[PDB]
Amino acid sequence: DWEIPDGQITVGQRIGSGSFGTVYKGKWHGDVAVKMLNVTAPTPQQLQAFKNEVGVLRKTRHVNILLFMGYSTKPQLAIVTQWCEGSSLYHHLHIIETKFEMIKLIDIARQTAQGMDYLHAKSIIHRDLKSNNIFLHEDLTVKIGDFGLATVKSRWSEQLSGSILWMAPEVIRMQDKNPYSFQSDVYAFGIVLYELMTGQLPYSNINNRDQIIFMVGRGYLSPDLSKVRSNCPKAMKRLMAECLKKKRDERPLFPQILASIELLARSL
Ligand SMILES: Cc1ccc(NC(=O)c2ccnc(C(F)(F)F)c2)cc1-c1cc(OCCO)nc(N2CCOCC2)c1
């Protein structure tokens, strides 16, 4: 089992906090990351979202997926994962503005498609794929996770969460019927491809969030693919357009995406 014996995990510096949890850099067989899902006695919702997140993570054993290490219920509900030196893709592209070579951008894309293909084969829909959830371990290896603390685990689009730029037209329309599919994860991956190849977030010239929501959902607005840097291969721009298709069934799945990136990478 993955239940860590009591009084083994130690917690150090607070790395983040939100409505749905607090993350610390901790110690348990070396450096680890610890997520405290509750503070006071947990609600039945918190216990269930904990059981569901642990259920998802315990099924993952892949180099491009954040390493789940274990869990604790005493004294608080905790999830222990590996600790990674580095920064997320978001930090690199939009905060410190790292100028990666085209070969590295294609490799980050390949490693993300690699981890995504794995999750989909295990019937795990990410539901929140974006550059912030793509960690660059030692600024070289992609480690996909869900580092967000604004959202809860399980169920599917209540809403209320700013990951709108990576939302497929069918997800951004905020309908009662569950809009989440493998294809909505592919659209989010297409947005990540846009960020890699442009170095920008889409719709940067629109200052109104409700207008972005309305227009993407209605198909009036889509990413400007002419913004992709000159050295972006024609196959990559073609793949990006395929992933961003408004009709979800027209979107390629990750075994196809992965084969397209692997062929692209060999032909540089
Ligand atoms: C500790 C923790 C526990 C569970 C989870 N859960 C998932 O990752 C998850 C949930 C649902 N599904 C999946 C899916 F991948 F299958 F989709 C994955 C995350 C963390 C966590 C939070 C976070 O946040 C930092 C503050 O934002 N930083 C990290 N780092 C680890 C690497 O070193 C830098 C710090 C780890």
Swiss-Prot record:
Positions with a binding annotation for ATP: 15-23, 35
Outcome recorded upon mutating residue 21 to E: In CFC1 and colon cancer
Effect upon mutating residue 213 to R: No effect on MAP2K1-mediated-BRAF-KSR1 dimerization, however loss of BRAF-mediated phosphorylation of MAP2K1
Cross-link (Glycyl lysine isopeptide (Lys-Gly) (interchain with G-Cter in ubiquitin)): 130
Origin superkingdom: Eukaryota
Disorder this protein is connected to according to its UniProt record: Defects in BRAF are found in a wide range of cancers. Colorectal cancer: A complex disease characterized by malignant lesions arising from the inner wall of the large intestine (the colon) and the rectum. Genetic alterations are often associated with progression from premalignant lesion (adenoma) to invasive adenocarcinoma. Risk factors for cancer of the colon and rectum include colon polyps, long-standing ulcerative colitis, and genetic family history.
Family: Belongs to the protein kinase superfamily. TKL Ser/Thr protein kinase family. RAF subfamily.
Protein function: Protein kinase involved in the transduction of mitogenic signals from the cell membrane to the nucleus. Phosphorylates MAP2K1, and thereby activates the MAP kinase signal transduction pathway. Phosphorylates PFKFB2. May play a role in the postsynaptic responses of hippocampal neurons.
Protein name: Serine/threonine-protein kinase B-raf
Gene that specifies this protein: BRAF
